Design a protein around this ligand. Structure first.
Ligand code: GTP
Ligand code: MG
Lengths: 180, 18, 198, 10, 570, 415, 142
């Protein structure tokens, strides 16, 4: 066999990568996906089903499948778990009551043998009010440091401002792609 | 040759039984 | 990418029931293998083959996520295939149409008339108790439109919602007011049907 | 055969 | 088409006549009414070619009933062909003469039949015997007038052992339709002559030879022993029908055999290998072998006492074969192989056949009821099936538990708690009535019997007549046993079944229960909640009179249907 | 006592029919198809149908149902034997059993049907005898049928007298899911293809346990077959008298004796399967095969069929010896091995995904069966002593025989 | 409205199927088999109207493949026949000399035409040219 075509494709960039969009409702997951794909804070109706979009960055098309945090849509995330290489959890630091629900949903999603190759992707959503926690308090509350065999990183991203999305995308790319 | 066991010659009767 | 015509010819070429079942099983295995890789180029052919197998009497449980993925796609052929799959293999008791509510809402505001009309037809054919609750507002919004080709679809969707949800007919009382002067035969027939249903 | 015949013969 | 075929048949060209005959045969086989061309082919019937003669004879046989009038132009041809030097031509003519269903045709064929009765060729003799049997079946009076009974009887004591077997079969068939007057029974010399020719008979002749011995009734132990010894070599025959006939003959002879003599033991020992060999026959004959084993099981159940591994249903076995294997295992179930039977039932309960699962559950319940040593094992299996989360399996387990409680409820109190909360939401009448009866009769180990019966009382007036009666009986039993917590429940049940119940039997039962409650509640405990006697289970064994009759009728259609020979024929 | 035996088709069309008694109307065949369809849809379908007072017994053939309608209480076993003989005769005359040959040899088929049975009683059943009197491409009937010896035609002359025997061994093991073998029976098969001159009377002799005990040599390895069935030419009288297997060998391939007895030895191939099936996530196939047979014997064309999931797709095979191929039609993975030497240990690790949507109904757990076939192996240990070939003219025969060991009903219950 | 409309051939093979009532797959298959058996076991002088399961089971096939409809007992019987004839004419116009072979190959096109013509069992396009033009425009989109 010959791998000349593969080398030629990789010389100019062929890797794409994947990503997942999961989290509690009103946690900025849809806003984060819109910012990654479009780059603007657009108001949208709640995601009853799921949102499919792709973002191209660093020559890699990291497609993100947004999943709503609704009760009727929470169990539907298993459909997107098939043929999925990444998983992103949307945290709601401004929703103390929903923080426990988001943590339970993240633990349930990470407690599946099928979702094992996808590293943890926790984004500190709602980073616009003083009530939002730091990058360590949220991780400590969610217990991300005790998740062995999972590359989980806590990043603070504000949907309105857009800061921190680039850092999260770079962390996801580093977790997925380990090349020069 | 042949699959399933090669053919072998067979005797006429039990020579030790008279 | 096996074409639908090729699959039909292969099915017709089989005489024994066992041979036809084996061919259908092989085709379903090939379709499942293609879908497991997240194929999107020959998705229309796979969807057509799955629909043909389901119509012949073959299981199609594994071909549910592919239809949902193709529904939220952008290709017109892929969208039509997804709508056909939702109408045929998707039902209220299936439970797989719950995630299709977001796709229907996204396609309800689509600028293309074929996409919006196809979505309205699929919603009317597969009307659910919970889908109509989250889609009642969208149906009423299109009922006041001046599109003759879409007026009949809006009337049919409203009638289906009323039949599935009798308590939602209160919101259609002012939408159909002053609609007896439609020149188009289809719009007038839809208005008359909606009035009779109410 | 009987399948190639037109449904309405028009 | 038809005109062209008629013109070709009315020609003097042999190739054209052969082509026309082949076309007519193909049209007849394809479903074409070629009876209208029969008179045309009548002229083109006397042909030297044997291929055309066979086709003409077949057309005449298939067109004889359709056109009986046109068949009168073939008597001369049949008479001419009956003296053909070629034995094949004579045999074909004899077969065609007996195959023609013509009332006036067989009358003129009596002379050819008499001429061919003494044919030297064994094939000719067999053909003549077949023609005589066909004529007797069509016209018994004509056969009696022709005096073919004497010729048929003498054919048995001659050479051509295949012809002798054919004549014996023809005589048996004539006597089978005979009213039993002037039977063709033979003395022991005839039986010995048949046995001597049995070894030289062919595969088909062996069945005919063994059929005659099926009607003969042995009267001496020495004669019975000789018959058993002669039939013993027949058990080593590759023919399934011959083996079945030999087994039936041995079973019939065992009716007069003495158990003290060692001949019966040897026959029983040699019968087991034959049953094992027959159990591994083709699927078409597997059902026949299973039916024969079941019929002979009730006669000599000790013959197949150790035949239990072969009774297991194979994975590739058919549904009928699996059902027959399950029935054989149930009939052959014993405490020695109780564990094997339970394992097979548990393995058989995991199949995807609903009917197969129900049959396995019924067999397990029957085995548990018949043998009380495996009552605990049966209860555990039923509990496992109920816990398996199968609707049909759960219903079968509930039915089995209800049946066991009525049969062996002395130690059935340990399953009331387990069966109290066992997905009782099933609406199956067979399971619901069984659960209601179990709760009513076993309303001592459950502290929430009234609460459980409250859910079933919502639709008591419209559930079912049997279901309503069972619910009323359970309520009455609960009130008699514990009326403190069911005083209002009994009154509500009486009101529902007495005022809102329009069933005549149900209304009468409710009125009787209300009268008993209002007359003497203390006496209701000794009247309603009385200790019932032992339940007399229905025996699956057939009557001894039918078993003896079924022994003689071995291999017939009645054995498979398990019905008397006169109760299945039309 | 069937009224008429006819050959049907897969579409209900009767390929060929031949009435023998005339007591049953030919129109009853049309109602046979609806009855069979109703029985199949309700699970009550049986080979012996019943149309009112007339029973239509049918046998599932390669392409058509051999329906033999009957009216009275005829011998069901006799009818089945006649149908089997007719099927064997058709297979001998026509290499293909389908609609292609049913409508292609009607001229000879009708003659064969007429000659085979008359008035419901079969008369001719020998394929050689039938071919010697009825051909598709007529003389008087042969004297062999009339003579006592109907299985050995006289006057046959050959340049050389060579007979090829075949010691066919069928290893059937019924291993339950618990790991224990329930039905472990081995059925012997002594089939010889005798091709010589004349009508020699074979004198079969083997290391039979009963014969060794009778002769006083019951101390060596002797095969004790629970059930032994002789061929048609085999004389039952000699076997019952002193176990003398004396009979005239047939012209061609025929089954002389077929042993059938239980087996109490360990299985030739020990296969252990592991099912690491995740909950709608993945599936694991920890299949390990151990060769329990002798190392000197190799199981050629060993195919251990492991049933995979019905909806399973995208499977990966991680084995050591033997190619693994997943057949979607069979819905299982067969561990095919070209050569399987005794004592070999093959380990396989299957891994495939499953659809997210659960199946609506269960598919069952079919047993795992292997197709191992190791020739030149005598598991039973029965050795043929001699073959007494005697001819009136006098000739030196050179009989040959080969022992073949294969896997029969070697099915292992799934977990 | 029409509960279900299915096109079944004379031999029993189904060339079309469109049910407007949500039913179980096994129940739907049983209903289709019963409808096929009733149509296959009915003569040509039965009026093409069957009251099966309280539904106006109207069977009227102009060729070897037959068509069946199931409507509630609240409208005239001739309306269903007229609608079936109009749908057949529209399909013939859209395809051109429609035969049994073309129906199997054009199953997706037939389903799209049926969806664009009748939705939810009710009539959606009274005109015959407007529906054809809409179908052609949708097909030309790609
Ligand atoms: N206005 C504002 N909203 C924010 C901010 N950060 C997070 N959000 C939340 O982001 C949500 C955006 O809604 P969506 O686009 O539907 O995305 P989502 O949060 O995943 O909600 P669902 O899609 O329904 O699951 C808002 O409802 C806010 O609650 C912020 O900085 N400003
Ligand atoms: Mg969202």
């Amino acid at each position: 066999g010959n791998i000349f075509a593969n080398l030629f494709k990789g010389l100019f960039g062929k890797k794409e990568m994947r990503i997942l969009m999961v989290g509690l409702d009103a946690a900025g997951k849809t806003t984060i996906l819109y910012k990654l794909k479009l780059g603007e804070i657009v108001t949208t109706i709640p995601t009853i089903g799921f949102n499919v979009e792709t973002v191209e960055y660093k020559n890699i098309s990291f497609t993100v499948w947004d999943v709503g945090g609704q009760d009727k849509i929470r169990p539907l995330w298993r459909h997107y778990f098939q043929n999925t290489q990444g998983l992103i959890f949307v945290v709601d630091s401004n929703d103390r009551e929903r923080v426990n629900e988001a943590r339970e949903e993240l633990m349930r999603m990470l407690a599946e043998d099928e979702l094992r190759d996808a590293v943890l992707l926790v984004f500190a959503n709602k980073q616009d009010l003083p009530n939002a926690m730091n990058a360590a308090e949220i991780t400590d509350k969610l217990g991300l440091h005790s998740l062995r065999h999972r590359n989980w990183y806590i990043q603070a991203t504000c949907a309105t401002s857009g800061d921190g999305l680039y850092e999260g995308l770079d962390w996801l790319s580093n977790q997925l792609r380990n090349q020069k | 040759d042949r699959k399933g066991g090669s053919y072998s010659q067979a005797a006429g009767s039990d020579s030790a039984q008279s | 990418p096996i074409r639908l015509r090729e699959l039909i010819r292969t099915i017709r070429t089989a005489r024994t029931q066992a041979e036809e079942r084996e061919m259908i099983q092989k085709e379903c295995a090939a379709i499942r293998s293609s879908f497991r890789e997240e194929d999107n180029t020959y998705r229309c052919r796979n969807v057509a083959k799955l629909l043909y197998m389901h119509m012949l009497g073959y299981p199609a449980h594994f071909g549910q996520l592919e239809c949902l993925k193709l529904i939220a796609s952008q290709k017109f052929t892929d969208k039509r295939i997804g709508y056909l799959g939702a109408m045929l293999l998707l039902d209220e008791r299936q439970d797989v149409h719950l995630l299709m509510t977001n796709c229907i809402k996204n396609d309800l505001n689509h600028s293309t008339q074929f996409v919006q009309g196809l979505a309205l037809c699929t919603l009317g054919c597969m009307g659910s108790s919970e889908m109509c609750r989250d889609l009642a507002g969208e149906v009423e919004k299109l009922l006041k439109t001046s599109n003759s080709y879409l007026r009949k679809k809006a009337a049919l969707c409203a009638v289906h919602v009323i039949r599935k949800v009798p308590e939602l007919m209160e919101m259609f009382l002012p939408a159909t007011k002053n609609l007896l002067n439609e020149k188009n035969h289809g719009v007038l027939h839809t208005s008359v049907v909606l009035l009779t249903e109410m | 055969k009987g399948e190639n015949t037109s449904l309405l013969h028009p | 088409e038809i005109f062209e075929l008629k013109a070709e048949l009315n020609s003097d060209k042999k190739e054209k006549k052969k082509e026309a005959v082949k076309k007519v045969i193909a049209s007849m086989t394809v479903g074409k009414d070629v009876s209208a061309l029969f008179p045309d082919v009548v002229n083109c019937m006397q042909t030297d070619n044997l291929e055309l003669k066979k086709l003409v004879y077949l057309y005449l046989m298939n067109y004889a009933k359709s056109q009986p009038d046109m068949a009168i132009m073939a008597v001369n041809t049949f008479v001419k062909d009956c003296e053909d030097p070629n034995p094949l031509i004579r045999a074909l003519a004899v077969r065609t003469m007996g195959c023609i269903r013509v009332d006036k045709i067989t009358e003129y064929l009596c002379e050819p039949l008499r001429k061919c009765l003494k044919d030297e060729d064994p094939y000719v003799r067999k053909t003549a015997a077949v023609c005589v049997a066909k004529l007797h079946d069509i016209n018994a009076q004509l056969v009696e007038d022709q005096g073919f009974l004497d010729t048929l009887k003498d054919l048995i004591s001659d050479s051509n052992p295949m012809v002798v077997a054919n004549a014996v079969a023809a005589l048996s068939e004539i006597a089978e339709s005979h009213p039993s007057s002037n039977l063709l029974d033979l003395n022991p010399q005839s039986i010995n002559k048949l046995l001597t020719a049995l070894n030289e008979c062919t595969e088909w002749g062996q069945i005919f030879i063994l059929d005659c011995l099926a009607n003969y009734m042995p009267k001496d132990d020495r004669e019975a022993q000789s018959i058993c010894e002669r039939v013993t070599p027949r058990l080593s025959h590759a023919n399934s029908a011959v083996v079945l006939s030999a087994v039936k003959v041995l079973m019939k002879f065992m009716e007069m055999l003495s158990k003290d003599l060692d001949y019966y033991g040897t026959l029983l020992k040699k019968l087991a290998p034959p049953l094992v060999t027959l159990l591994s026959a083709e699927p078409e004959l597997q059902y026949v072998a299973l039916r024969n084993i079941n019929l002979i099981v009730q006669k000599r159940p000790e013959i197949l006492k150790h035949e239990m591994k072969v009774f297991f249903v194979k994975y590739n076995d058919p549904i009928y074969v699996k059902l027959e294997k399950l029935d054989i295992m149930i009939r052959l179930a014993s405490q020695a192989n109780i564990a094997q039977v339970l394992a097979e039932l548990r393995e058989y309960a995991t199949e995807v056949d609903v009917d197969f699962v129900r049959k396995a559950v019924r067999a397990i319940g029957r085995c548990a009821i018949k043998v009380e040593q495996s009552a605990e094992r049966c209860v555990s299996t039923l509990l496992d099936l109920i816990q398996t989360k199968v609707n049909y399996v759960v219903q079968e387990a509930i039915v089995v538990i209800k049946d066991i409680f009525r049969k062996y409820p002395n130690k059935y109190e340990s399953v009331i708690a387990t069966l109290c909360e066992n997905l009782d939401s099933l609406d199956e009448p067979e399971a619901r009535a069984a659960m209601i009866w179990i709760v009513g009769e076993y309303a001592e180990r459950i502290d929430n019997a009234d609460e459980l019966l409250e859910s079933f009382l919502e639709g008591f007036h419209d559930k079912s007549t049997q279901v309503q009666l069972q619910l009323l009986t359970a309520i009455v039993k609960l009130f008699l046993k514990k009326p403190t917590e069911t005083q209002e429940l009994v009154q509500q049940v009486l009101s529902l079944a007495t005022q809102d119940s329009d069933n005549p039997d149900l209304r009468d039962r409710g009125y009787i229960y209300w009268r008993l409650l209002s007359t003497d509640p203390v006496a209701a405990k000794e009247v309603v909640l009385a200790e019932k006697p032992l339940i007399s289970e229905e025996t699956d064994l057939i009557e001894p009179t039918l078993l003896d009759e079924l022994i003689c009728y071995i291999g017939t259609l009645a054995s498979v249907y398990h019905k008397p020979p006169s109760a299945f024929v039309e | 006592s069937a009224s008429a035996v006819y050959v049907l088709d897969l579409k209900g069309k009767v390929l060929i029919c031949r009435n023998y008694r005339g007591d049953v109307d030919m129109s009853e065949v049309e109602h046979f198809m609806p009855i069979l369809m109703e029985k199949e849809e309700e699970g009550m379908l049986s080979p012996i149908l019943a149309h009112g007072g007339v029973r239509f017994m049918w046998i599932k053939h390669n392409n058509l149902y051999l329906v033999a309608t009957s009216k009275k209480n005829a011998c069901v076993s006799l009818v089945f034997s006649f149908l089997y003989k007719v099927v064997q005769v058709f297979s001998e005359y026509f290499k293909e059993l389908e609609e292609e040959s049913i409508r292609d040899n009607f001229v000879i088929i009708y003659e064969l049907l007429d000659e085979l049975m008359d008035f419901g009683y079969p008369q001719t059943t020998d394929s050689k005898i039938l071919q010697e009197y009825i051909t598709q491409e007529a003389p008087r009937p042969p004297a062999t049928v009339t003579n006592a010896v109907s299985w050995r035609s006289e006057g046959i002359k050959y340049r050389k007298n060579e007979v090829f025997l075949d010691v066919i061994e069928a290893v059937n093991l019924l291993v339950s899911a618990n790991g224990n073998v329930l039905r472990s029976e081995i059925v012997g098969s002594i089939k010889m293809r005798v091709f010589l001159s004349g009508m020699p009377e074979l004198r079969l002799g083997l290391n039979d346990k009963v014969l060794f005990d009778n002769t006083g040599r019951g101390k060596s390895k002797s095969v004790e077959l629970e059930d032994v069935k002789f061929h048609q030419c085999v004389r039952l009288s000699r076997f019952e008298n002193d176990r003398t297997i004396s009979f005239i060998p047939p012209d061609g391939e025929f089954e002389l004796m077929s042993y059938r007895l239980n087996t109490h030895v360990k299985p030739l191939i020990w296969i252990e399967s592991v099912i690491e099936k995740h909950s709608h996530s993945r599936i694991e196939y920890m299949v390990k095969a151990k060769s329990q047979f002798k190392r000197r014997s190799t199981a050629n064309n060993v195919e251990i069929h492991i049933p995979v999931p019905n909806d399973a797709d995208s499977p990966k095979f991680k084995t050591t010896v033997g190619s693994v191929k997943w057949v979607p039609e069979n819905s299982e993975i067969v561990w095919s091995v070209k050569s399987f030497p005794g004592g070999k240990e093959y380990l396989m690790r299957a891994h495939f995904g499953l659809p997210s949507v659960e199946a609506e109904d269960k598919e069952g757990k079919p047993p795992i069966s292997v197709k191992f076939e190791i020739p030149y192996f005598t598991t039973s240990g029965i050795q043929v002593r001699y073959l007494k070939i005697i001819e009136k003219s006098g000739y030196q025969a050179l009989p040959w025989v080969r022992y073949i060991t294969q896997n029969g009903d070697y099915q292992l219950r799934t977990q | 409205m029409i509960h279900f409309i299915l096109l079944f051939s004379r031999q029993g093979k189904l060339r079309l199927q469109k049910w407007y009532i949500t039913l179980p797959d096994k129940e739907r298959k049983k209903i289709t088999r019963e409808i096929v058996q009733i149509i296959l076991s009915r003569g040509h002088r039965t009026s093409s109207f069957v009251d099966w399961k309280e539904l106006k089971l109207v069977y009227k096939r102009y060729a070897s493949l037959y068509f069946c409809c199931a409507i509630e007992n609240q409208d005239n019987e001739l309306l269903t026949l007229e609608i079936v004839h109009r749908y057949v004419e529209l399909l013939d116009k859209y395809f051109g000399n429609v035969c049994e072979l073309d129906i199997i190959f054009n199953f997706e096109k037939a389903y799209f035409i049926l969806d664009e013509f009748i939705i939810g069992g009710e009539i959606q396009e009274t005109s015959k040219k407007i529906a054809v033009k809409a179908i052609e425009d949708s097909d030309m989109l790609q």
